[PDB]
Each structure stands twice: as structure tokens, then as C-alpha cells.
Amino acid sequence: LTQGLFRGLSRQETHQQLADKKGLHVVEIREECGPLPIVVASPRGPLRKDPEPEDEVPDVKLDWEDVKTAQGMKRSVWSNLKRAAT
Amino acid sequence: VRSSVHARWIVGKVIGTKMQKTAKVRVTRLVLDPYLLKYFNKRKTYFAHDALQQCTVGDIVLLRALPVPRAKHVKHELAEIVFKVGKVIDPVTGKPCAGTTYLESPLSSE
């Protein structure tokens, strides 16, 4: 668990790194901030003019636990329990 | 217009012609699995009235609900044979076909 935790956190991709790789702006959308587009990272080099291909159906692998929780089908007496501040 | 039969229009596949003036038709519907959220075919057997006994085992038929059930289990009648078994006529072009190849070329009649 300890070695796994440091492995993933070391390999996370920052927004600035993603913007540089894709050559595009990374825009943050916050529900609290409404529809206001917020630029968190911009590529230092040339900026691409062609938009990313908007795939109608993304081919990504979904964890069943996340989907089941989202649909409310996951009941658990041990979830969302009130606990001390961390 | 009014009919007591719940299933007004249904399309199924004939699985038996062993009864007089009645074709046993199997109807499949897509039913959602509550947990897997994937649709699987659910098959129910319907008896259809066939006056001319022109149905053949293995074809696709259209069933119209009778105003009243003429028998205990016969509630529908043969409306139109959508796809005859082995003698399918392509609705788009009107030419006979055998699978994905036209038996008669659509360019024969321009």
C-alpha cells in the first residue's frame, strides 16, 4: 500500500504537462462558478487550432463501484459514516 | 377498433403449423435487466389465426389483435407475412434476394 501510493502519486500528470502535450488550453468548469471558463494551464509553445475530435461514445473502462454508487444501487451501512476530522 | 387483446400489433417468428387454421408464433421483446442494464430477448408464444394456412415454419409474420379472442389461446390473426422463409423480397428494391445477394439485379428494371 505504501509503495503503491507513492508510485501512483509520482506518475500523476499535472494540468500544465497535459496542456503542453496536447498543445491546448485546459479549461476548468466549476458548478459553484457557473459557466465561467477558467484557464488553469496554457501551453508554452505553439497552440493547436484544430479542436479535439468529440467522440460520441468514449471507449473508457468504468469501475462498477463508481457506476453503482452513482445509480444509487449500492446500499452500505458502513458508507458515509460520520467520523472525526482528519 | 376497440379490442380486448393487450397485444395489438406484434411481429414474431412462426415455430409451428401443426394446428388447423392456427400458426404458433414466437414473439421476442427486449427486456431490461435491472442489475446488468443490458437488454436480453424474452420469448412469449402467441397463437395466430391463419385462414389460408399459408404460414410456413420459420418465417416472420405480422399479427393483428382480434376484437375478441376466438379461442382460449388464439387472440391474434395473421395480418401479413413480412419475410417468407427462403423467399424474402427486399422492401427497398422489390427484387428477390437470398441473404445479402440479389437473386434479380435491381438494374433489370432500371
Partner: protein, 295 residues
Amino acid sequence: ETKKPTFMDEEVQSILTKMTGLNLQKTFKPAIQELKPPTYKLMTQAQLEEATRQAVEAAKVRLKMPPVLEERVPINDVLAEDKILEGTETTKYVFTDISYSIPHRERFIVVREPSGTLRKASWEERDRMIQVYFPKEGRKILTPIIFKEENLRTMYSQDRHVDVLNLCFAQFEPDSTEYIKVHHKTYEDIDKRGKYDLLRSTRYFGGMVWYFVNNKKIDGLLIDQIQRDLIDDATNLVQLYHVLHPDGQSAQGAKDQAAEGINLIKVFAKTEAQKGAYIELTLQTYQEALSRHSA
């Protein structure tokens, strides 16, 4: 003949909107509420501008100026006076029609008095009864103590004049007496302390200007706009005052001198503005600063 323009007229709407200004930062300020993990999108320069345009469009809807209404006439109407029921009941009965497909200003709310007289419910009673059967978020059946003089002055001391207007709008109807008093008291505190910038880029800015023009007290607002380099809005303030007061010294002075642009303020400052000397000094200070930047 000649009719004075109303608050909802397009000429007034266009001028007030330009005096409000769309600030996407303030119009969509990060609110302190329950938060969710934000989503991220990879957008080009063209898409980012389009997203900015949609935020501008959504800002206009949020910045729609509420209509301004006069105080509603109190309802004193009697449907019938049945003297037979006099003294039989010690408590009056309030009847509210709760039919769903009826506007809340067209519902028959009647009160059966202990004297036996059947009368229509007053405005204060009608608003209270509507919330009972058709609750609205943010509106309390009992008037909150926030609207007392001491509590409101506390809000003013904290520069939260927008919060007061938000609370008043949710609780009281626009034509209610309490709605008018709270808005008018809020406007007076703004003018006294020169807090006009708080209501900028808000849907309530237009009402503040409308209150000031109708009382010929745009002297404070004109000073603030000039000091913030808003001459285009400052000129529109003088022009709007002239439109709503054709028979005035400033309005007649403008016609005689054919003043336009900055000259309009000078005519208004000398003729009708109470603090004309301060306005002239303020306008002179801006004009000197602008000249240096021109060179």
C-alpha cells in the same frame, strides 16, 4: 402629448445596462456552498472564446434588471356583511383558493371576520397565505428580524448591500411597502457613504440609478463615475436625467448651449447639481489627467 419614459423602456434599458457592465468574475463569483469535483476540457483558442461568449450570454440573464413598481394600493373590499353571525365565533376564518392553475395575483383570499363581515384579505395577509400553501425558497412566512433597522445597519457596516437586496427580493413582493422601504433605505446608505461600486455588475444597479434620478440626487453617483474613468456612463447619467426632467434648468441649459459629451456635466453641475463646485473640481482633475495620456 409627451410621456416621460418608464423604467422598462428600451432606451432606459439600454442606458442602464451599459451603466451596469458584465463582470464575468463578479457575476459568477465562487459561491460558498456544497462543492463537487470540477471537470476539465481541452479547448482551443476559438473554443475558449466561444465558452467566454456563452458566459457573457448567461451573465445577461443573471443581470436582468427587476421591474420597478409603485406601492400597491391596500385592499379594503367587503363582499358581504352577514350580521346574523355576529358574536358567534371569536376567531376570524381565512379562506385561500389553492387551485394550482391560477396566478398568485388572481387568487380569491377572503376573511370571515368575527363580526360576520366577509372581506377580501389584505396584501400582507395574501402574501403570508400564499407562502403557506405554495412555499417559495428563501421566503419566510414571518418577517425575519434581518429587516429591522439595527440588523440592516449591521449589514451596511459590513458592505453587504447586495445581500440585503437579495434577501428583500426573495421575501417581499416588488410592490409591497416593506420592499420599497428596504430598497430605498439601502440606496440612501449607498449614496451617503459612496458605495455605488458594490452594486456595479449586478441586476440591482438599474434600480439604484432610477431612484437617484427621480430624486435629483445623482450628484454622488456622477462624482464616483468620473473618478473611476466612466465618462461614457457619466454622460448617459446626465442625459437620462435630462430625458426624465425636460422642464429643468439643466435640461433647458443643454438645449440652449447644444452641449454634448463632457459639456453636459458642466451644464448640469452649474445649473442643478447641489455640489457643483465639487463636480467641477472632480471633472477638471480628470480632464487634466486625460490630456497627459493623450500626449
